[PDB]
């Protein structure tokens, strides 16, 4: 039962991370990974909870997050999944760190209280 202030804040963070301003490095994180189409057929030997920014935005809009900590964890999972499958130094790994850098900056503005 997340409240309006927390909801608006979260949607704002997700909207920021998906915005075209970051298109040159956020495009791997906008939609669900498709292992076969991306020629990474072993993706789900490394990842067991897929998450992407579009999915966080849908769960948000469907009132599926109880509170801000829960939302933060789904967003953070996008990047843990990235590093679980893409080694250091690869392009997608580095894109993930750059987008996470922005997430870290934006998330520190969160309301102290996750209203209900």
Author numbering: 301 to 416
Question: What do the authors of the reporting publication say about this deposited model?
Answer:
The fungal Bromodomain and Extra‐Terminal (BET) protein Bdf1 is a potential antifungal target against invasive fungal infections. BET proteins bind chromatin through their two bromodomains (BDs), BD1 and BD2, which specifically recognize histones acetylated on lysines. We show that Bdf1 is essential in C. glabrata, and that inactivation of both Bdf1 BDs induces lethality.
We used a peptide array comprising histone sequences with diverse post‐translational modifications to probe the ligand selectivity of C. glabrata Bdf1 (CgBdf1) BD1 and BD2 (CgBD1 and CgBD2). Like other BET BDs, the two CgBDs displayed weak binding to mono‐acetylated peptides, enhanced binding to di‐ and tri‐acetylated peptides, and strongest binding to a tetra‐acetylated H4 peptide (H4ac4; acetylated on K5, K8, K12 and K16). CgBD2 undergoes a minor conformational change to accommodate IBET‐151: in unbound CgBD2, the side chain of “YPF‐shelf” residue Tyr327 adopts a gauche minus (g−) conformation, stabilized by a sulfur‐π interaction with residue Met395, whereas, in the complex, Tyr327 adopts the trans conformation to avoid a steric clash with I‐BET151, thereby widening the ligand binding pocket.
